[PDB]
Amino acid sequence: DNMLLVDDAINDDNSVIAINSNTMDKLELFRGDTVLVKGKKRKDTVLIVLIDDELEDGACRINRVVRNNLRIRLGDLVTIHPCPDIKYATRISVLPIADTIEGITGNLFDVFLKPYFVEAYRPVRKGDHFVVRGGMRQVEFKVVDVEPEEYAVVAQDTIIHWEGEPINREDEENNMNEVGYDDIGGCRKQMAQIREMVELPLRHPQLFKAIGIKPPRGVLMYGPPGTGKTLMARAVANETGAFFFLINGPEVMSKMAGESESNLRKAFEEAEKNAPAIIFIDEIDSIAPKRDKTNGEVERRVVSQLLTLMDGMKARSNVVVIAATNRPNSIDPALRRFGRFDREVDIGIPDATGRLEVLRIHTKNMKLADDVDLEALAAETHGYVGADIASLCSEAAMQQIREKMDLIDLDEDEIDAEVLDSLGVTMDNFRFALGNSNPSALRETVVESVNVTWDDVGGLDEIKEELKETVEYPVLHPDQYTKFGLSPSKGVLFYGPPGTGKTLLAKAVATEVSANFISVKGPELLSMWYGESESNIRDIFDKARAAAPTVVFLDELDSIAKDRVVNQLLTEMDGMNAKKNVFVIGATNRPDQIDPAILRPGRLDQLIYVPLPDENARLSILNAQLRKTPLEPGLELTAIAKATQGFSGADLLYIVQRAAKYAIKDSIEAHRQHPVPYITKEHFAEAMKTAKRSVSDAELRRYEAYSQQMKASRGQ
Amino acid sequence: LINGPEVMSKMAGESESNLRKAFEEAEKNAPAIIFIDEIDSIAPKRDKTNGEVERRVVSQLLTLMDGMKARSNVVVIAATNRPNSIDPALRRFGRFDREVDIGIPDATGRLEVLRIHTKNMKLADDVDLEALAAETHGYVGADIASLCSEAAMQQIREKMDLIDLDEDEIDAEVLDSLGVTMDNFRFALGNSNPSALRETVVESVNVTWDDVGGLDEIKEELKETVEYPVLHPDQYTKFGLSPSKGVLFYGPPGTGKTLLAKAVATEVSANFISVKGPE
Amino acid sequence: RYGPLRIKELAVDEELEKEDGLIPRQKSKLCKHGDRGMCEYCSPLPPWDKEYHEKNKIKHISFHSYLKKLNENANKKENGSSYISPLSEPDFRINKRCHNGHEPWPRGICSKCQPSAITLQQQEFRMVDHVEFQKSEIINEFIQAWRYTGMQRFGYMYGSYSKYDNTPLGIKAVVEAIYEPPQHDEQDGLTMDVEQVKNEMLQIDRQAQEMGLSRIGLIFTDLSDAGAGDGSVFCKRHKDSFFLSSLEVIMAARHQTRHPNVSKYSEQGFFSSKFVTCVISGNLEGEIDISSYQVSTEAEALVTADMISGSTFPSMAYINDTTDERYVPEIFYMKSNEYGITVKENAKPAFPVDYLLVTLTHGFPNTDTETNSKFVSSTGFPWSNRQAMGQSQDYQELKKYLFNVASSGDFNLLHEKISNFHLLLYINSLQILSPDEWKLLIESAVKNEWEESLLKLVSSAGWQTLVMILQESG
Ligand SMILES: Nc1ncnc2c1ncn2[C@@H]1O[C@H](COP(=O)(O)OP(=O)(O)O)[C@@H](O)[C@H]1O
Ligand SMILES: Nc1ncnc2c1ncn2[C@@H]1O[C@H](COP(=O)(O)OP(=O)(O)O)[C@@H](O)[C@H]1O
Ligand SMILES: Nc1ncnc2c1ncn2[C@@H]1O[C@H](COP(=O)(O)OP(=O)(O)O)[C@@H](O)[C@H]1O
Ligand SMILES: [Zn+2]
Ligand SMILES: [Zn+2]
């Protein structure tokens, strides 16, 4: 109907749109009609309709300036509606762009605008752009202000105020707010959650009146720093079109005593007075830290004022409060109950596709060279948040500048445009930037996604089926459990010799049910025990709840399970709701050393043995670790697998690594002497000559004895 | 009405004059009721706060409370989650002496709460609020309200397929077709997460001498120990013998000691408080 | 409104806002850096720097500079907010409708709609800085009123505002003429029905606006004669005594509340009326020195909700009692001791008014500069409401005053006699002249380049009738 296709208009007029005759008949439009056109980002404009049969039915033509104003590209769909109630502009104040007006003498108004508006009746709306082509020059302008507001028709008698200081162009670009969803990638799940939690209360309030419920108000986002929380909040606010009222934490806390409270009160009052609105309290942890932190009165009055304001807004006002904190435990506990920030959202490091999306988003203004393999960079960047990727791009560009610096005269302040053209980033530059990268997200526990199937784990079919029936069935067929009245099992404990690949089994289990994975290695547990860490077990389980369905993994639990930490872990495990799809998987090498309390029913009761890989399993592991390596044609690893009886997966990795080391040594020696694109069987034999088992016979016998004891304990 | 944080957020020297004027006005227009919500924030434990203002406020509160005790028909009510958090000096004669304990509701209480909250929602015919009340255990009223809100949100999310978000308004038929199904409530139960049980709370139990097996002599001994003092204190006074205080169960694990304790509590119709090992 | 409010205000405010007022400073001898690059002592001094004001013997900070300080203190550009109005006039009246669950104040109140304790403190910014009397005659005639009658007086003072270079971003109110409302003056005080005063002043101010003036304050004389041989007067208003007793402060606060100043930086659009009150008391010697004052903004918003009344002690203002429709919270007045520590003293029975005032600097135009006085007049046709004295406006005085000049010519002499404020008001009162004829009359009498307009005026039949009836009348 009104979803007209966008196309480039022949005319250069800034307020003229050509439409097809068929569409004109459908919409009952006519030549010269002023119509309101809406595109994307809620952008709107006023265009004079002109019949044009050249366009295909259902298509319209607009010029470059109108498309730029509408923030839309050719081929999109725009909605055109009648605008019969547009009045003549009583007074329009307009200012030019400085860079455009450079080199112009005389009165700009007479030169450009006076012929442009006389006998033109061009509709003008605030925030629009119009370009005047006079003589040999072309100058753009802005619709700074219109009376009556917000738009009106510039008639012959309309007064135009061109007086005013030039407007810098840098503000429009470098201040690129109004960022849409297209500027956020790799976090579609959390973006969808925030959208479904914010848009519907504001865009369609009548829904909840029809259902007769009070929609949730508070929202609390948290995650590692640099994951785009502020960017997501800004994008949601801009798309929703609400009265955004960004509030910073450090900014509020930097005011004199007795002023931060006033700022908070004024902010909340203005947000209420202009409903609907969206208040974003950035870095709330800087306003209301944990109780054990600063006890100063100035640090308590602000928290009390914030609590009072949060409790006082419960009314028919459309106010939504969004807060961002690095960790959930930093905020005062009082801010996590009903009527307050009761809804939580967790941001985690992206996967390969997310990193690719981030790279493409950032690497659209770069003058990249042809040899770009963004997929390769995404594969080789693990654990990078968006900020790290942006820094990587900046460093790569700086490296390219350094490389091209040879053709630059530093003393001279002007650089040849030819040299500027030659600038282009290359894959080597990105590799160097990675070499100079300093990721820091992984220093703490963070939600992440894994993509391991039942192919990187060789053999162990019975274990695979046991894990499937333990985990996958509850998630996919909970209705059956309800029908039979059986509560799903919470977690399991993997025990066995080191290197059996327990982490791989955990990752596979997480992948099958499409669940986020959280890892807690031994050093993290020790740091928590000493109390010098930035996070605590309660925080870990809160994040697990927030990012459900999650899978928490503990490694070498025997170090702490040899106790305050174990008590906290038991309390948290008992606390969690059974229905929540949260699974705690523990890995250890000395099960008998584990505290018996951990093994009680209702806890990590199920005990699963992870045996060493067998011949076929070893062959599969070797083939898997060598899939992306150039091997000798006609080479067979069956003999090597047969000869490696009793070796663990880590041992096979070590053998392959030594073979690769010998291959690279030989290749480098040959190149220096100057061939060997692959690895010959002699390298594998040399590597195997140094093979050494990582498991002693006594320990394996002890594991077998423990397994036999466990089987006897269940054999009657 | 006086709030804790609301008074605490005032400038220095103004959080006490407000209390003074509050009490004076309450006296002027008797009968009056004063609800000092979140009294802990303005009177925490003595060790928690050492600042001068945090003691000026408490002293002013105590002086006003002592001066209020008179013919005036004014009653003071205070609320605080932790009974020990309040300054101990506030719990003497002539002050907040009478104490009331609020415990998590039972199945009947949960049913009543659900009915009270679920009176306006467009509930579908296939709703079994009794089943929800039975399943929800340890859910405080706030948790139940959140559960209902989440279920309604899930229902609207499911119906979103036919809803065009771009249009400001929606077809009236779709708006009038919203209906909450039992599956939505089950999903909300799955999502929800109560937190009352994290700390010790008072709750009732309904275990009789039929969910346990055997132990007939033990049951008789427990009855003689607890029931008779509660049901027939008159005869105990007649003989002048005070009842025994406590009892200690010992034996192999998994024999059902918790069920015996719950049954004993139910027989005397007394509230049950528990303290697990981790606590 | 996604930014600063949109409204049109006085030209003085606009031009002052355009400036920034930075006071440049040169290389200090303590700097350690090359020629370019300023470290900490060479930076420009902001216009609100209190050190400069107190070092130059200026007691207040030229309100516009205070606005600049407030704007700089917050409201980061391009981000950090969506604009918060920096100026807000305090209001003490209890919110009649809060309803968190309680009923209106008369029978119910919560802690959210309870007027918090008021901390009285001397204001630091004075709206209008310098009050300037164009000519000595304007006030000499006023004092001559007291000389002749012996009773006190009271009169509004019309004029216009302009810049004041001598102070950073300062404003000066130049007073052009004085109009005396009908009042019943007496030895110890004066009285006047408010209804008549406002009814008369409405039309008088309409005519003044037509003439280009504006009501910019009230002036009253508190003078007593001494026992010396000549005319000497006691100095009853000094540091020890009361500068302004309670009642005058109350009246000034009411007047300010009823003459709001339109501003672009408040939610309501008004803040701290630019109204100046002048009192004549006499300096430490026997002279007849004048003074100026202005009640602070808190006192402006304090009298509106009653809460203040006069006290038998001249220097202290009584405080009223709580009652329905009037809630009065505890009032703490903050002072400073000799040890540099602020002390809060509760003063319920009564407190001094020294904390509710800001003092302005009176003066007269330099006697060696261009003369831009609207009216070269005020020694002639007697002023309006001097019925108590012999002065009385009527046909006979016009015949004696403005007949021989018109009957012959000499337009140069005529112009000054036609540029008298009260003369214009009286002739307009007669209603003899037609509207447009009166408009061109005022345009000739209050503007330069008046030859053609004056000739046209004397041409119009209205003036011919005026002169004819004047001559015919005794
Ligand atoms: N999709 C994205 N996810 C994460 N970061 C992104 C994304 N797109 C861009 N970025 C960049 O990552 C950074 C995110 O900053 P952010 O962590 O939100 O700031 P804050 O510290 O205020 O939370 C910015 O430099 C932003 O440009
Ligand atoms: N099917 C498999 N069985 C055992 N190990 C494997 C298998 N597939 C891969 N591996 C390798 O085993 C290693 C396990 O490392 P590590 O975590 O230190 O020991 P574990 O996983 O046994 O705790 C991984 O680096 C991985 O490359
Ligand atoms: N008569 C009984 N004897 C033993 N166990 C029972 C009996 N009745 C119920 N149970 C079961 O015992 C479990 C709780 O055992 P209990 O002894 O109360 O706690 P614990 O095992 O910690 O001592 C419950 O899951 C319940 O199903
Ligand atoms: Zn310097
Ligand atoms: Zn109220």
JSON list of C-alpha atoms in Angstrom, two decimals, chain C residues 187-257:
[
{"chain": "C", "resi": 187, "resn": "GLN", "atom": "CA", "xyz": [4.55, 61.76, 61.36]},
{"chain": "C", "resi": 188, "resn": "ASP", "atom": "CA", "xyz": [5.60, 58.23, 62.31]},
{"chain": "C", "resi": 189, "resn": "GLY", "atom": "CA", "xyz": [4.35, 56.29, 59.29]},
{"chain": "C", "resi": 190, "resn": "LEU", "atom": "CA", "xyz": [2.25, 56.25, 56.15]},
{"chain": "C", "resi": 191, "resn": "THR", "atom": "CA", "xyz": [-0.87, 54.38, 55.05]},
{"chain": "C", "resi": 192, "resn": "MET", "atom": "CA", "xyz": [-2.61, 53.72, 51.75]},
{"chain": "C", "resi": 193, "resn": "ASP", "atom": "CA", "xyz": [-5.44, 51.47, 50.59]},
{"chain": "C", "resi": 194, "resn": "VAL", "atom": "CA", "xyz": [-3.96, 48.79, 48.35]},
{"chain": "C", "resi": 195, "resn": "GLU", "atom": "CA", "xyz": [-6.98, 48.57, 46.04]},
{"chain": "C", "resi": 196, "resn": "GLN", "atom": "CA", "xyz": [-6.88, 52.21, 44.93]},
{"chain": "C", "resi": 197, "resn": "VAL", "atom": "CA", "xyz": [-3.11, 52.11, 44.57]},
{"chain": "C", "resi": 198, "resn": "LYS", "atom": "CA", "xyz": [-3.12, 49.08, 42.28]},
{"chain": "C", "resi": 199, "resn": "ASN", "atom": "CA", "xyz": [-6.11, 50.30, 40.26]},
{"chain": "C", "resi": 200, "resn": "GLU", "atom": "CA", "xyz": [-4.45, 53.66, 39.61]},
{"chain": "C", "resi": 201, "resn": "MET", "atom": "CA", "xyz": [-1.02, 52.16, 38.98]},
{"chain": "C", "resi": 202, "resn": "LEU", "atom": "CA", "xyz": [-2.39, 49.78, 36.35]},
{"chain": "C", "resi": 203, "resn": "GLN", "atom": "CA", "xyz": [-3.37, 52.64, 34.05]},
{"chain": "C", "resi": 204, "resn": "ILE", "atom": "CA", "xyz": [-0.38, 54.77, 35.03]},
{"chain": "C", "resi": 205, "resn": "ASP", "atom": "CA", "xyz": [1.96, 51.91, 34.13]},
{"chain": "C", "resi": 206, "resn": "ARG", "atom": "CA", "xyz": [0.07, 51.32, 30.87]},
{"chain": "C", "resi": 207, "resn": "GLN", "atom": "CA", "xyz": [0.67, 54.95, 29.92]},
{"chain": "C", "resi": 208, "resn": "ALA", "atom": "CA", "xyz": [4.31, 54.70, 31.02]},
{"chain": "C", "resi": 209, "resn": "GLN", "atom": "CA", "xyz": [4.81, 51.59, 28.87]},
{"chain": "C", "resi": 210, "resn": "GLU", "atom": "CA", "xyz": [3.32, 53.55, 25.98]},
{"chain": "C", "resi": 211, "resn": "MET", "atom": "CA", "xyz": [5.99, 56.15, 26.79]},
{"chain": "C", "resi": 212, "resn": "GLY", "atom": "CA", "xyz": [8.74, 53.52, 27.06]},
{"chain": "C", "resi": 213, "resn": "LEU", "atom": "CA", "xyz": [9.27, 53.49, 30.84]},
{"chain": "C", "resi": 214, "resn": "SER", "atom": "CA", "xyz": [8.68, 50.67, 33.35]},
{"chain": "C", "resi": 215, "resn": "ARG", "atom": "CA", "xyz": [8.01, 50.47, 37.08]},
{"chain": "C", "resi": 216, "resn": "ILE", "atom": "CA", "xyz": [11.33, 49.52, 38.66]},
{"chain": "C", "resi": 217, "resn": "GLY", "atom": "CA", "xyz": [11.00, 50.08, 42.39]},
{"chain": "C", "resi": 218, "resn": "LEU", "atom": "CA", "xyz": [9.53, 52.02, 45.29]},
{"chain": "C", "resi": 219, "resn": "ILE", "atom": "CA", "xyz": [11.17, 54.81, 47.30]},
{"chain": "C", "resi": 220, "resn": "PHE", "atom": "CA", "xyz": [10.10, 56.08, 50.72]},
{"chain": "C", "resi": 221, "resn": "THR", "atom": "CA", "xyz": [11.62, 58.58, 53.14]},
{"chain": "C", "resi": 222, "resn": "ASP", "atom": "CA", "xyz": [12.31, 57.86, 56.82]},
{"chain": "C", "resi": 223, "resn": "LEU", "atom": "CA", "xyz": [13.63, 61.23, 57.98]},
{"chain": "C", "resi": 224, "resn": "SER", "atom": "CA", "xyz": [13.59, 63.03, 61.31]},
{"chain": "C", "resi": 225, "resn": "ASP", "atom": "CA", "xyz": [14.92, 66.50, 62.08]},
{"chain": "C", "resi": 226, "resn": "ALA", "atom": "CA", "xyz": [17.75, 67.11, 64.54]},
{"chain": "C", "resi": 227, "resn": "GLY", "atom": "CA", "xyz": [18.23, 69.91, 67.04]},
{"chain": "C", "resi": 228, "resn": "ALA", "atom": "CA", "xyz": [21.09, 71.60, 65.20]},
{"chain": "C", "resi": 229, "resn": "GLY", "atom": "CA", "xyz": [20.70, 75.11, 63.84]},
{"chain": "C", "resi": 230, "resn": "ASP", "atom": "CA", "xyz": [20.61, 73.92, 60.23]},
{"chain": "C", "resi": 231, "resn": "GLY", "atom": "CA", "xyz": [18.75, 70.94, 58.79]},
{"chain": "C", "resi": 232, "resn": "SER", "atom": "CA", "xyz": [20.30, 67.81, 60.29]},
{"chain": "C", "resi": 233, "resn": "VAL", "atom": "CA", "xyz": [18.72, 64.37, 60.63]},
{"chain": "C", "resi": 234, "resn": "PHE", "atom": "CA", "xyz": [19.49, 61.45, 62.94]},
{"chain": "C", "resi": 235, "resn": "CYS", "atom": "CA", "xyz": [20.99, 58.23, 61.57]},
{"chain": "C", "resi": 236, "resn": "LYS", "atom": "CA", "xyz": [18.57, 55.67, 62.98]},
{"chain": "C", "resi": 237, "resn": "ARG", "atom": "CA", "xyz": [19.68, 52.97, 60.50]},
{"chain": "C", "resi": 238, "resn": "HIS", "atom": "CA", "xyz": [23.26, 51.80, 61.09]},
{"chain": "C", "resi": 239, "resn": "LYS", "atom": "CA", "xyz": [25.06, 48.57, 61.96]},
{"chain": "C", "resi": 240, "resn": "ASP", "atom": "CA", "xyz": [23.87, 48.52, 65.57]},
{"chain": "C", "resi": 241, "resn": "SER", "atom": "CA", "xyz": [20.31, 49.57, 64.71]},
{"chain": "C", "resi": 242, "resn": "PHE", "atom": "CA", "xyz": [17.94, 48.11, 62.11]},
{"chain": "C", "resi": 243, "resn": "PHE", "atom": "CA", "xyz": [18.68, 48.68, 58.43]},
{"chain": "C", "resi": 244, "resn": "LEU", "atom": "CA", "xyz": [15.09, 47.84, 57.47]},
{"chain": "C", "resi": 245, "resn": "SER", "atom": "CA", "xyz": [12.45, 46.89, 60.02]},
{"chain": "C", "resi": 246, "resn": "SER", "atom": "CA", "xyz": [10.14, 43.94, 59.48]},
{"chain": "C", "resi": 247, "resn": "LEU", "atom": "CA", "xyz": [7.24, 45.69, 57.76]},
{"chain": "C", "resi": 248, "resn": "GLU", "atom": "CA", "xyz": [9.21, 47.31, 54.95]},
{"chain": "C", "resi": 249, "resn": "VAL", "atom": "CA", "xyz": [10.90, 43.97, 54.30]},
{"chain": "C", "resi": 250, "resn": "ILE", "atom": "CA", "xyz": [7.49, 42.31, 54.04]},
{"chain": "C", "resi": 251, "resn": "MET", "atom": "CA", "xyz": [6.19, 44.94, 51.64]},
{"chain": "C", "resi": 252, "resn": "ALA", "atom": "CA", "xyz": [9.31, 44.71, 49.48]},
{"chain": "C", "resi": 253, "resn": "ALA", "atom": "CA", "xyz": [9.00, 40.92, 49.33]},
{"chain": "C", "resi": 254, "resn": "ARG", "atom": "CA", "xyz": [5.37, 41.20, 48.23]},
{"chain": "C", "resi": 255, "resn": "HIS", "atom": "CA", "xyz": [6.28, 43.75, 45.56]},
{"chain": "C", "resi": 256, "resn": "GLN", "atom": "CA", "xyz": [9.07, 41.52, 44.26]},
{"chain": "C", "resi": 257, "resn": "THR", "atom": "CA", "xyz": [6.74, 38.52, 44.12]}
]
